[PDB]
Design a binder for this molecule. Structure first.
Ligand SMILES: O=C1NC=C(F)[C@H](O)N1
Ligand SMILES: O=C1NC=C(F)[C@H](O)N1
Ligand SMILES: [Fe+3]
Ligand SMILES: [Fe+3]
Lengths: 423, 423
């Protein structure tokens, strides 16, 4: 029955703070002028950093843990990945999807992630994975608020009954409408697919998250239609453009023109560093492009951008432990957001910016909000990122739902010495 | 008084193995047909992976821990980095260099690194850092065999008395002769500097490690002179070309021609993933090149290539905990060595290949060799890399010199559950 979080550091704030908890919510936040004593019912942050929970804005829980089944993606490309997934999709069973999704979700809970948006392939007349995921959503609710995107992986207009299946998925309860314009057979189908996606989102009052321009094609500009339709409907807050890796290859003049619309539209952007560095640049010899969208410029322009893990051991990515600080680490390097302040503020890319992408209404350390927060054994964002620290405690509804007793490293010199990699 | 390492897995080998130790050496290695019981004097690898120690083939211990002093490298480029370092170099003191070097060395010991090659800037008439590092080398010897490269950071022919200072550093005991041809004022000075470097290495019987073509200039081809001079002198095993990031920008025809010489010469290559992804591509707008040398092609051609951390919190890199598995993780992503086998064999890039780069004569788990080895709590290279595991035990001369009690993570669901991120 926790009543207070004491000795907490907060990003962008000086000193220590006390967070009072009442009835599963944050009742008040007060600055401390020194270190407070521990006591029963008090969770001691020990001058560590307290932040709202990590968020996973983009993952594929229906494909997670399937890498190599029945075959491996040899080329390491998005296109072969979809082909390898199609082979696995034909072998799906309800229980298998639930088991694999739950395996990755447990890693996420352990990693302080309390909000997850999973795409689920609905280019499947049986909607096997979707039915399984809707059950997982209910089962995992005490620990993670899971959003499900009805993702038409093989296209809306380019797959048999694609539009009907996408709508069926919404009627079954999917929270977000997906699309993949660059995978449609033609540019015209791509644009038309977006009009259909927006019409469905307005008909059912759902969010939108488009796999948008995930291709090293300087002519893949579906993002301008996503932003324009959102602006026209006055619904930018409910819309997300995932990937936009083609933007890495656009000329600068078009990008500058486009940025005005991106800002005016208010839509969100998701970059997936671990997967993008792996799948993009595969058609270059040397030099080889990085292939991540224009994260640095978006931040400078005040456009909301955040980071997702995208895949965890599946056709598009052979690694991962569903760790957001690891995703952030890769993104900061590839996007060259390596200034001290840029690294320190990096936490926003896996917390607040992602919460905005998911249109969350109860997020942040503020009075009145649910007591959902995590404690990192680090002094600030820079320190947490540099040392790739685990989540010491994850609190949800005012209760501890995960904890990590840190590793203990000792070197035996003339005398034993504890090493914590700090300075 | 350890007598045996039991239940050890070895890369590329099936089953479990027992490593018998006698008089600080490995006396014999025998396969097990099952799990052996623990007993006093036996170190149980617990079916974890046993490998020779991690190696750091390229780091700057004279600059480590100085990021932001007195100013930060704002552009994130090699060139500004050297300028910021020059400002810090003027403030060096003997004790400060020793303290900072020892701080990073302790992190390395904790991370199972028993072999380290540090470059030390000798473009300094006072040779302050070199004198300090020669003392550190002696002090750290019980735990790490430290090689010192006399690195003429500001050039040999382009800095006052550069050649005399480089030779003075060798007379004081530096183990390796360095150079930086692409930083010399002219291409001719660059080539001439290499002839002088090789002449010094033959005069003093020292190794060579050139900061070679660390620039996104398709015309920076000093590597062909390094390889040709090594081939002419029949000394490839003693020569290393660090960085060669310009190779990322070469046309393919010249690279193919060059590769024949690289193979024939037998020289070694070091890629520094964390720093290269950060400092390279800084003059591109979009698309932006990755800038790491041709690691994948070198491996396919049987050319020895390995990975270094290069910098730990200094003018050229604001992060790091001197962790080789983290360096490897970045390299596998940026170089797209993402096939299962490529990832699994990744350990060679931070163990055996690096030992060859340092021309080590006592390295590897083989009878007769010193009992220097480390134990990773993982099933194989892939698993160790994916989970970024710590070093459970580091053994040197048959004695434990470092150990890490792993972190313990628990999620509180309907029942508490331990999470180890394994599958
Ligand atoms: O279309 C896609 N499917 C799965 C992925 F992991 C990638 O995000 N893109
Ligand atoms: O010339 C250089 N000095 C320092 C570095 F870290 C980089 O390796 N290159
Ligand atoms: Fe995706
Ligand atoms: Fe270097």
């Amino acid at each position: 029955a926790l009543q207070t979080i004491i000795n907490a550091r907060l990003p962008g704030e000086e000193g220590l703070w006390q967070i009072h908890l009442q009835d599963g919510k944050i009742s008040a936040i007060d600055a401390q002028s020194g270190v407070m004593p521990i006591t029963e019912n008090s969770l001691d942050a020990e001058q560590g950093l307290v932040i709202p929970p990590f968020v996973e804005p983009h993952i594929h829980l229906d494909t997670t843990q399937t890498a190599g089944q029945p075959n491996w993606n040899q080329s390491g490309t998005l296109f072969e990945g979809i082909e390898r997934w199609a082979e696995r999709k034909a072998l799906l069973t309800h229980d298998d999807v639930k088991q694999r999704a739950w395996q990755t979700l447990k890693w996420q809970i352990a990693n302080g992630i309390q909000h997850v948006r999973t795409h689920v392939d609905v280019s499947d007349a049986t909607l096997t994975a979707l039915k399984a995921m809707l059950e997982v959503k209910q089962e995992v609710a005490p620990w993670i608020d899971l959003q499900i995107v009805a993702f038409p992986q093989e296209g809306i207009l380019s797959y048999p009954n694609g539009e009907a299946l996408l709508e069926e998925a919404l009627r079954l309860g999917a929270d977000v409408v997906g699309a993949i314009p660059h995978f449609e057979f033609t540019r015209e189908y791509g644009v038309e697919s977006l009009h259909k996606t927006f019409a469905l989102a307005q008909k059912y009052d759902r969010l939108i998250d488009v796999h948008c321009d995930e291709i090293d094609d300087e002519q893949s500009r579906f993002v301008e239609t996503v932003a324009a339709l959102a602006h026209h409907e006055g619904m930018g807050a409910r819309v997300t453009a995932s990937h936009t890796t083609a933007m890495h290859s656009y000329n600068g003049a078009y990008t500058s023109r486009l940025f005005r619309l991106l800002k005016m539209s208010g839509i969100n952007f998701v970059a997936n560093p671990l997967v993008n560095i792996h799948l993009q640049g595969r058609f270059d010899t040397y030099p080889k492009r990085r292939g991540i969208t224009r994260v640095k410029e978006m931040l400078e322009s005040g456009i909301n951008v955040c980071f997702g893990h995208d895949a965890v051991f599946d056709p598009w990515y052979p690694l991962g432990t569903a760790n957001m600080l690891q995703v952030l680490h890769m993104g900061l390097h590839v996007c060259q957001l390596m200034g001290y302040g840029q690294i320190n503020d990096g936490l926003n890319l896996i917390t607040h910016h992602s919460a905005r992408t998911l249109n969350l209404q109860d997020y942040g350390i503020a009075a009145g909000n649910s007591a959902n927060l995590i404690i990192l054994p680090a002094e600030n964002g820079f320190d947490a990122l540099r040392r790739q620290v685990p989540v010491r405690y994850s609190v949800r509804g005012g209760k501890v739902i995960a904890s990590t007793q840190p590793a203990q490293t000792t070197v035996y010199l003339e005398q034993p010495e504890a090493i914590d990699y700090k300075r």
